[PDB]
Design a protein around this ligand. Structure first.
Ligand SMILES: CCCCCCCCCCCCCCCCCC(=O)OC[C@H](COP(=O)([O-])OCC(O)COP(=O)([O-])OC[C@@H](COC(=O)CCCCCCCCCCCCCCCCC)OC(=O)CCCCCCCCCCCCCCCCC)OC(=O)CCCCCCCCCCCCCCCCC
Ligand SMILES: CCCCCCCCCCCCCCCCCC(=O)OC[C@H](COP(=O)([O-])OCC[N+](C)(C)C)OC(=O)CCCCCCCCCCCCCCCCC
Ligand SMILES: CCCCCCCCCCCCCCCCCC(=O)OC[C@H](COP(=O)([O-])OCC[N+](C)(C)C)OC(=O)CCCCCCCCCCCCCCCCC
Ligand SMILES: CCCCCCCCCCCCCCCCCC(=O)OC[C@H](COP(=O)([O-])OCC[N+](C)(C)C)OC(=O)CCCCCCCCCCCCCCCCC
Ligand SMILES: CCCCCCCCCCCCCCCCCC(=O)OC[C@H](COP(=O)(O)OCCN)OC(=O)CCCCCCCCCCCCCCCCC
Ligand SMILES: CCCCCCCCCCCCCCCCCC(=O)OC[C@H](COP(=O)(O)OCCN)OC(=O)CCCCCCCCCCCCCCCCC
Ligand SMILES: CCCCCCCCCCCCCCCCCC(=O)OC[C@H](COP(=O)(O)OCCN)OC(=O)CCCCCCCCCCCCCCCCC
Ligand SMILES: CCCCCCCCCCCCCCCCCC(=O)OC[C@H](COP(=O)(O)OCCN)OC(=O)CCCCCCCCCCCCCCCCC
Ligand SMILES: CCCCCCCCCCCCCCCCCC(=O)OC[C@H](COP(=O)(O)OCCN)OC(=O)CCCCCCCCCCCCCCCCC
Ligand SMILES: CCCCCCCCCCC1=C(C)C(=O)C(OC)=C(OC)C1=O
Lengths: 105, 80, 94, 169, 110, 98, 314, 96, 347, 70
């Protein structure tokens, strides 16, 4: 029994902390504001059963924004191959990846 | 009601001062002419960048320069 | 259905009340001088038992072997912040 | 090493819980939970949770664990193999987790876990002239009105409830 | 980082002075002491009143924890709601104090 | 996912299995329960700071306050048990077997 | 270079705690119509040195402790927390310039009761444990009015930054708008440090009577570091001095004179009053200071709003 | 006195915030060129490292969207030195 | 207890259950459970004996463990979804932890081990609150997360609750432990149909609360906590034996009574989903609950156990106890089966 | 008389004077004859790291003015 008193009375007791894309103090965006806005606007109103299969792509992009598992796995692959080629002597870093180049601004 | 006040002011003046200060703190922001200015100052404080509007062609109340006459002014805060 | 395991289980009380199955005693010792045996009930003092005799020196048995002039300076040392008053009390007695 | 420091603190954090989950006595258990609270506070502070970390000190440690140690001091009259074995067991399980995720840069206990330092997943921008965590806690009085009502009512009820059940009548 | 250096220096100075205070008179070979309390051997009597003042501290400290973001909360643009809820939290701390008062909870440690 | 989250979850499970395997004292059970609460505080805090989800920053404080109030209630229960048997041993709490 | 700054903080702390003992004995001498120490050094200036060397070669009491580890950790924690309360103190510049220096000080002074608690449980005497629990209950009681008075003052500051508290008081001392907060604050700092008329660890055996003379001297010097520190924090908080950013030593001399006068005011209060009974200072906290502190907390919430004087966040 | 002085301090806060606002477009342009510099450097070094690895697409986004994602800390400073990593990811937390 | 304090504490129990029912944020769900436990602890310690302190300690420990597992499920949902809406969970680990937490809060087997102790340790009115009002909030959270509840887990909890609540009451003579094992078996029946049709879950919950409130109201109106003191009721008040007869026959699911109404409908919703073995073994296991109900009806209504002499004094006084809604709850727990299609008001 | 207590007060006051004078002089020595940069907020740290990059010598306190542009 979800007695939806907040929609019946028109009061906002707890909807404001419910999502990251809601209204925030000083308009501070979440780090996954755009992905969650896309997943919600995809999945809105069509029901959860249709949302699990018709909005899976935006949900996967949003989960991968939140947890960065694919990004960390890709950086693991690049850094592991990089240290392997350092060990094999076949690669050398540039001067801008060693700290010898007096950064941009 | 006046004998009760002198009685509790003779017996327990800490609690009389406590309820007096608390009652002033409750009622007095609804009676002050400066409570409007607290809100006006808090909304005049620019924590964020004032993101500009795309000029469509009809916005006579939005300036094109910060030193333009139209727009919200803060002479009320400089004067007070 | 009582088994061998549940052979010691007695029934609960009818009013569901089981029986509950003290107060502090402090010996403020000599560490003038005075011993106190406090029976306290928290902050409150229930009993105060002052144990004395830590300066009983047998003064008035020693008076019994000394003359009246000789027993005068024992009175300086009884109420030993009130010396000449006790001298006066003994003098008025004699 | 210093790029892994939050992870390192978390290791001590887990070791701190094996300090008191083995339960030597409630007093050393309280001490282990205090040290655990300090190092978990350090974990919080190294993400930018300054106010939340000082709530771990002021309210969890300085407020609540003081009352735990105070109540414990009014019990357990002042004067094991199970505690020692469980402590070395939890120690070895945690350092085997450490060894696996540091030699593999991936582990999977229940979920998959990266083996790099947790610095990688931060943000590369500024918050301007505020702390975002500070303004989100300050919005408890502007946006969190219902939350303040139910929290203050629970604390008032907590005062009433403690005075009821401790009275014994 | 400077804070970690400072905490380590303070802890190291404290541990150094504690080690010096615990082991500088141990170099002396004074004597071995035998030495064979107001309570004689009685068990520590529990007092309900110390536990009540400790729990009352904990509950008012949770109310303090709610009160702590007020200097940042005054900067809001919803000042009527902020002021109402601020006065309401201080009033609920006052009502907790009044209920602790009038039901004799603040007695013999008043 | 992130490597620190592994340790905070594993700390929660360590304090769980400590709370799910008593030795004698009820106070050690309360300490395991508050270790669980502390690990929940740390994990919620690291997520909310990590995601820059601003309005949930008041969430761990709430997660503190309620649960510490809960802890206070638990301490009172221990004291009442300690006012019945002299100790807080959980094997004295066995009258309800019959 | 930063470690030089840390040592030039913490070693003069130890020297000022050493000579605060001499200043206390002298000022309490002349207020009691006698002299203080003037034989050991010229004007008694070698009395703390002689007394420290005496205490560090005094025999250990060698007691039976329930915990050896907490018996070691209670002086370590007391000294460490006594030294870490100084590092955000803006005088005119803090060692560690942190954004939440006030809240850091409030937390690290809330952690100071574990020294009393661990040292009381480490003593096998039940009477020492009872006195430790009374001292802990006193201290955590007065922490409440510390936190709420401090919050009510910092509603005029705008932040928890201690360095901003100098900027706050450029036109007036903050003792003028907050003297009831200032006087309840001063008595609450008097009751935090177990200082007379609130010294029930010397009223008829405290928590640390079971230590050796060395660790007792360490507890004593942590307590006097807390006294000097809370007077400096009170001086920064209510009696904030003038600061020229090109001449910082003007602020240093000014707050140093004010903090010395406030520490001597502690010395002068213990030379003037009888002790409270324990329930009487519980009555002073829970039934006198806390209703006034809640009323003034409501007042200092609502007063920047009704006057339009809400201070800046930054 | 606190009324007059806090009102002047609010005016000073607004003056500092307007200075920040006037400087923000220059800082935003510099930051945009900064992060695109670092991503192009990482992309070219990824191209010259990940040649032996089978099936590797250089610059392969892990998102199905073509929208610009704000770059992560490890995406920018992953190939650089740990000193720059510390001085870009813990410095403000550790600064005094 | 002060009556004003009692009213404020009972309104706080109700307010905790309401905040669980009406909120859209998981933190407010956890807050409502915390408020509910925090307020219901003094209701259990109403009489101040060591049994109520033991019962309240066991209740506190199990509900606190469940609240911490609930918050860990919430926090894992925040990991894998970044939001806080009270809806389906976005991780099977969070779903398993929340199902475990709610099975602990309901006291479903094998987390049942607190329910017969705590109900025995507390008075009959607080046992009524524990066995009726404290089900409404966790069943509401289970009602809202049923897209994510694992089928095998909730059905294992359901059949283990029905079997353990069946065999538990067969050895009992205390009425509060009988009602507690009856509670465990009925919660098994309610969650066995949760993923198939939650309207029948709400039906079984309402009919169970009516029958349980009838039985506790009869136990309070006769001041009876054991079987053997319930057996003196025919010599004191012969109407109450007929009332406990028809209500215990109704709780066993014997038609034409109202407690036949849920379980039949439950079977009616489990065979549409092609489960035949499972409602059959559930209904066969419900005969155990019926058996110890029949034991109580033999002890109370259908025979006359011998009384004592002092009962003759109690003949000279009528019951002044406020038997609130007892004829209403007696009628609504027995004669309601011809109104079985009223259940569509719960859809 | 009462001025006999003033040597101890003088010693203690010099010892209280030392830390603030020391941190002021060490901040001016370690930061180019000026105050230590106060970075409480991430914008101040952003400008400070920008200063450390535009100085060229990896020191934020080395200021660059109009002479660094044409
Ligand atoms: C909607 C759901 C309603 C649920 C029930 C609501 C009431 C119960 C909750 C509160 C409670 O305990 O009240 C006592 C309760 C009676 O319980 P009791 O103590 O066992 O009563 C025994 C005798 O009444 C004791 O006699 P007495 O001498 O002490 O007082 C006589 C009393 C005097 O009456 C009055 O004083 C009434 C006037 C006061 C009311 C307010 C006026 C302002 O007479 C009555 O109350 C007669 C009984 C009325 C019927 C009670 C049950 C109501 C219907 C329940 C729902 C049925 C659903 C069936 C569905 C079936 C199919 C699925 O209610 C009343 O006293 C008033 C009932 C009014 C019913 C109005 C229904 C429509 C409302 C719109
Ligand atoms: C920074 C604050 C102040 C720091 C502390 C003060 C600085 C000085 C610290 C050292 C003081 C001198 C040594 C310890 C005291 C010696 C007194 C004593 O009992 O001596 C006899 C003791 C024991 O001699 P003993 O054999 O005659 O023992 C006496 C006891 N009987 C006879 C019953 C067995 O001598 C020592 O312990 C000698 C140890 C070495 C002395 C110091 C070496 C140089 C240190 C520099
Ligand atoms: C007893 C409760 C007393 C205080 C009630 C709320 C007072 C107030 O300022 O509410 C406005 C505030 C805020 O209103 P507002 O007008 O500031 O809302 C603007 C929207 N935001 C904040 C996002 C910019 O609260 C509400 O309107 C809803 C929450 C409270 C609803 C009433 C709760 C009653 C509980 C009874 C049990
Ligand atoms: C920070 C710099 C220094 C600050 C000042 C401190 C320096 C002086 C210190 C002197 C030595 C003190 C030693 C310890 C003394 C402890 C005892 C003591 O004083 O107890 C406190 C006593 C306690 O009361 P009591 O114990 O004396 O009285 C008996 C109490 N009953 C009746 C309950 C039994 O007083 C207070 O608590 C007062 C605290 C300050 C109150 C400030 C009120 C300000 C004005 C409010 C408004 C009043 C007007 C009416 C309304 C007008 C509205 C417009
Ligand atoms: C509305 C604004 C907000 C109000 C709430 C917040 C106030 C802030 C302060 C919080 C104080 C919390 C605790 C107050 C408890 C009051 C009840 C009380 O203490 O009654 C007992 C007392 C007799 O004392 P006793 O029982 O012996 O206790 C030992 C001390 N002698 O009895 C007494 O001493 C009698 C005291 C009651 C009468 C006080 C009257 C003060 C009048 C001041 C001016 C008008 C203020 C108007 C505000 C509303 C007043 C009701
Ligand atoms: C299976 C799930 C847990 C997996 C890890 C197990 C760790 C080792 C514990 C195994 C059991 C050892 C033991 O003696 O358990 C009983 C003991 C409490 O019993 P006690 O009263 O001390 O002694 C009487 C003996 N029944 O029980 C305890 O003291 C248990 C304390 C558990 C604390 C967990 C510490 C971390 C363990 C690794 C991560 C999980
Ligand atoms: C920030 C500043 C902090 C300052 C803190 C300290 C303030 C007070 C400093 C001390 C002031 C002067 C004290 C002089 C004491 C008397 C010394 C003396 O003359 O001792 C005489 C004694 C025996 O001499 P003898 O030759 O036998 O005499 C017969 C003569 N026909 O011979 C002896 O005893 C041997 C010689 C001992 C000399 C000791 C002198 C005092 C040592 C003080 C150490 C600390 C000083 C400050 C350090 C930091 C600043 C440099
Ligand atoms: C029995 C055991 C031993 C007992 C004796 C020793 C321990 C007790 C005494 C020491 C207490 C240690 C306190 C450590 C954290 C203090 C809080 C803190 O860091 O506050 C300062 C500041 C917050 O302010 P803010 O300005 O916002 O941050 C800088 C942003 N520009 O934040 C910062 O500046 C952040 C700086 C980086 C983060 C620092 C983390 C320190 C390491 C983790 C804790 C280690 C200690 C663990 C045990 C604690 C006590 C139980
Ligand atoms: C989708 C569904 C959503 C939710 C729908 C609504 C669900 C309602 C569930 C109601 C549960 C009620 C629990 C019991 C009432 C709560 C308060 C209570 O326990 O009162 C008993 C009270 C205590 O008095 P006391 O003096 O302590 O008794 C001991 C004697 N010395 O007094 C007594 O002891 C006197 C004895 C009689 C008390 C019986 C009260 C029964 C009231 C409930 C009736 C049944 C529920 C309503 C009908 C079904 C609705 C679904
Ligand atoms: C690192 C060591 C520094 C020196 C030790 C602390 C300073 C000397 C204080 C001596 C002292 C005095 C004068 C003193 O009077 C006193 O009794 C109340 C003490 O406590 C036992 C003392 O410790």
């Amino acid at each position: 029994p979800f007695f939806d008193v907040q929609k019946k009375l028109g009061v906002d007791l707890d909807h404001w902390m419910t999502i990251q894309s809601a209204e925030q103090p000083h308009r501070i965006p979440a780090r996954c504001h755009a992905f969650e806005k896309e997943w919600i606007e995809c999945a809105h109103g069509i029901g959860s059963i249709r949302a699990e299969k018709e909005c899976k792509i935006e949900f996967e992009d949003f989960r991968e924004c939140l947890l960065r598992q694919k990004t960390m796995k890709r950086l693991n692959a690049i850094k592991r191959q990089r240290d392997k080629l350092i060990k094999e002597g076949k690669y050398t870093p540039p001067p801008h990846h060693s700290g010898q180049e007096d950064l941009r601004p | 009601v006046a004998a009760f006040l002198k009685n509790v002011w003779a017996k327990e003046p800490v609690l009389v001062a406590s309820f007096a200060i608390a009652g002033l703190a409750v009622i007095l922001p609804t009676l002050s002419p400066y409570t409007k200015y607290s809100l006006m100052i808090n909304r005049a404080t620019p924590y964020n960048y004032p993101v500009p509007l795309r000029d469509d062609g009809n916005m006579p109340d939005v300036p094109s320069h910060p030193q333009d006459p139209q727009g919200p002014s803060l002479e009320w805060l400089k004067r007070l | 259905y009582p088994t061998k395991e549940t052979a010691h289980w007695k029934p609960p009380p009818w009013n569901d009340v089981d029986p509950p199955k003290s107060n502090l005693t402090l010996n403020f010792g000599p560490q003038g001088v005075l011993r106190l045996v406090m029976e306290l009930s928290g902050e409150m003092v229930r009993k105060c038992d002052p144990h004395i005799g830590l300066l009983h020196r047998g003064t008035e048995k020693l008076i019994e072997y000394k003359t009246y002039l000789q027993a005068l300076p024992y009175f300086d040392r009884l109420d030993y912040v009130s010396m000449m008053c006790n001298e006066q009390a003994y003098s008025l007695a004699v | 090493m210093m790029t892994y420091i939050v992870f390192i603190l978390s290791i001590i954090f887990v070791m701190g819980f094996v300090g008191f989950s083995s339960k030597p006595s409630p007093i050393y258990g309280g001490l282990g939970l205090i040290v655990s609270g300090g190092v978990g506070c350090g974990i919080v502070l190294n993400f930018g949770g300054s106010f939340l970390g000082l709530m771990v000190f002021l309210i969890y440690l300085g407020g609540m664990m003081v009352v735990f140690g105070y109540t414990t001091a009014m019990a357990t009259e002042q004067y094991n193999k199970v505690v020692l074995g469980t402590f070395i067991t939890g120690l070895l399980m945690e350092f085997l987790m450490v060894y696996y995720v540091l030699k593999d840069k991936e582990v999977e206990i229940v979920f998959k876990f990266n083996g790099m330092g947790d610095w990688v997943i931060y943000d590369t921008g500024d918050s301007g002239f505020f702390s975002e965590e500070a303004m989100g806690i300050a919005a408890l009085y502007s946006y969190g009105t219902w939350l303040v009502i139910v929290t203050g009512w629970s604390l008032l009820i907590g005062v009433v409830v403690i005075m009821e059940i401790t009275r014994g009548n | 980082m400077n804070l970690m250096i400072t905490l380590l220096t303070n802890f190291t100075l404290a541990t150094l002075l504690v080690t010096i205070a615990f082991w500088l008179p141990q170099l002396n070979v004074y004597s071995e002491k035998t030495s064979p309390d107001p309570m004689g051997s009685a068990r520590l009597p529990f007092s309900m009143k110390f536990f009540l003042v400790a729990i009352t501290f904990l509950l008012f400290d949770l109310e303090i924890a709610l009160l702590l973001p007020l200097p940042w909360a005054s900067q809001t643009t919803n000042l009527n709601t902020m002021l109402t809820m601020a006065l309401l939290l201080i009033f609920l701390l006052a009502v907790s104090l009044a209920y602790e008062w009038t039901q004799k909870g603040l007695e013999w440690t008043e | 996912m992130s490597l620190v989250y592994m340790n905070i979850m594993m700390a929660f499970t360590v304090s769980l299995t400590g709370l799910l395997m008593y030795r004698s004292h009820l106070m050690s059970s309360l300490l395991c329960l508050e270790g669980m609460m502390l690990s929940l505080f740390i994990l919620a805090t690291l997520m909310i700071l990590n995601s820059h989800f601003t309005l949930a920053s008041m969430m761990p404080i709430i997660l503190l306050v309620f649960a510490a109030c809960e802890a206070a209630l638990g301490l009172s229960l221990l004291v009442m048990v300690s006012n019945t048997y002299g100790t807080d041993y959980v094997q004295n709490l066995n009258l309800l077997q019959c | 270079m930063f470690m030089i700054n840390v040592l030039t903080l913490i070693i003069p702390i130890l020297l000022a705690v050493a000579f605060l003992t001499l200043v206390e004995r002298k000022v309490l001498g002349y207020m009691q119509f006698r002299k203080g120490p003037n034989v050991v050094g010229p004007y008694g200036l070698l009395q703390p040195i002689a007394d420290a060397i005496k205490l560090f070669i005094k025999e250990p009491l060698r007691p039976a402790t329930s915990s050896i580890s907490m018996f070691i950790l209670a002086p370590i924690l007391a000294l460490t927390l006594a030294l870490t309360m100084w590092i955000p103190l803006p005088m005119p510049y803090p060692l560690i310039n942190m954004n939440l220096g006030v809240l850091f000080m409030l937390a690290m002074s809330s952690l100071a009761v574990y020294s009393i608690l661990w040292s009381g449980w480490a003593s096998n005497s039940k009477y020492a444990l009872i006195g430790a629990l009374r001292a802990v209950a006193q201290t955590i009681s007065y922490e409440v009015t510390l936190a709420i008075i401090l919050l009510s003052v910092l509603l005029m500051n705008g932040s928890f930054t201690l360095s901003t508290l100098i900027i706050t008081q450029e036109q007036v001392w903050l003792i003028f708008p907050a003297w009831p907060l200032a006087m309840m604050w001063f008595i609450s700092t008097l009751a935090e440090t177990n200082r007379a008329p609130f010294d029930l660890t010397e009223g008829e055996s405290g928590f640390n009577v079971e230590y050796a003379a060395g660790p007792f001297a360490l507890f004593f010097m942590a307590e006097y570091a807390n006294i000097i520190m809370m007077n400096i924090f009170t001086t920064t908080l209510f009696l904030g001095a003038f600061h020229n950013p090109y001449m910082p030593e003007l602020y240093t001399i000014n707050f140093t004179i004010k903090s010395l006068l406030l520490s001597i005011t502690f010395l002068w209060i213990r030379a003037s009053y009888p002790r409270f009974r324990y329930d009487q200072l519980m009555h002073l906290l829970w039934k006198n200071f806390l209703p006034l502190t809640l009323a003034l907390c409501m007042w200092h919430v609502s007063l920047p709003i009704l006057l339009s004087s809400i201070p800046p966040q930054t | 006195s606190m009324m007059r002085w806090n009102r002047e301090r609010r005016r000073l806060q607004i003056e500092d915030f307007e200075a920040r606002i006037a400087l923000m477009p220059l800082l935003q342009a510099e930051k945009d060129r900064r992060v695109l510099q670092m991503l192009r450097e990482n992309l070219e070094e990824e191209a010259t490292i990940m040649k032996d690895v089978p099936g590797w697409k250089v610059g392969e986004s892990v998102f199905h969207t073509t929208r610009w994602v704000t770059p992560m800390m490890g995406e920018l400073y992953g190939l650089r030195t740990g000193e720059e990593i510390l001085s870009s990811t813990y410095g403000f937390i550790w600064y005094t | 207890m002060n009556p004003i304090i009692l009213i404020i504490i009972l309104m706080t129990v109700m307010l905790g259950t309401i905040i669980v029912m009406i909120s859209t944020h998981w933190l407010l769900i956890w807050i409502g459970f915390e408020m509910n436990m925090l307020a219901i602890i003094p209701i259990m310690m109403k009489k101040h004996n060591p049994r109520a302190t033991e019962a309240s300690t066991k209740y506190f420990l199990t509900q606190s463990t469940a609240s911490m597992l609930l918050m860990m499920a919430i926090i894992i949902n925040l990991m894998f979804s970044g939001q806080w809406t009270v809806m389906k969970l976005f991780n099977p680990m969070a779903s398993m932890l929340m199902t475990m937490a709610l099975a602990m809060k309901l006291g479903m087997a094998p987390f049942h081990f607190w329910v017969p102790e705590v109900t025995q340790g507390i008075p009959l009115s607080s046992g009524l609150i524990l066995l009726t009002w404290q089900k409404l909030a966790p069943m509401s959270v289970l009602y809202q997360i049923l897209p994510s509840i694992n089928l095998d887990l909730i059905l294992t909890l359901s059949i283990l609750s029905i079997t353990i609540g069946g065999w538990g009451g067969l050895n009992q003579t205390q009425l509060r432990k009988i009602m507690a094992y009856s509670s465990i078996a009925h919660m098994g029946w309610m969650t066995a149909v949760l993923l198939y049709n939650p309207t029948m879950t709400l039906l079984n919950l309402i009919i169970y609360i009516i029958m349980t409130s009838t039985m506790f109201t009869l136990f309070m109106a006769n001041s009876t906590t054991t079987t053997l003191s319930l057996s003196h009721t025919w010599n004191k008040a012969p109407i109450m034996t007929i009332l406990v007869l028809i209500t215990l026959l109704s709780m066993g699911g014997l038609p034409p009574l109202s407690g036949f109404m849920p379980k039949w409908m439950i079977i009616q919703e489990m065979t549409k989903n092609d489960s035949i073995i499972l409602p059959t073994l559930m209904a066969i296991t419900a005969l155990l609950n019926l058996y110890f109900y029949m034991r109580l009806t033999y002890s109370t209504a259908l025979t006359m156990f011998p009384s004592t002499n002092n009962m003759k004094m109690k003949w000279q006084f009528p019951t002044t106890k406020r038997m609130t809604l007892l004829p209403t709850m007696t009628v609504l727990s027995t004669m309601l089966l011809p109104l079985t299609p009223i259940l569509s008001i719960l859809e | 008389m009462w001025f006999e207590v003033l040597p101890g007060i003088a010693v203690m006051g010099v010892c209280l004077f030392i830390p603030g004078m020391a941190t002021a002089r060490i901040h001016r020595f370690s930061n180019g004859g000026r105050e230590k940069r106060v970075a409480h907020y991430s914008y101040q740290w952003y400008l400070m790291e920008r200063d450390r990059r535009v100085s060229g010598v990896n020191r934020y306190y080395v200021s660059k003015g109009l002479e660094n542009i044409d």
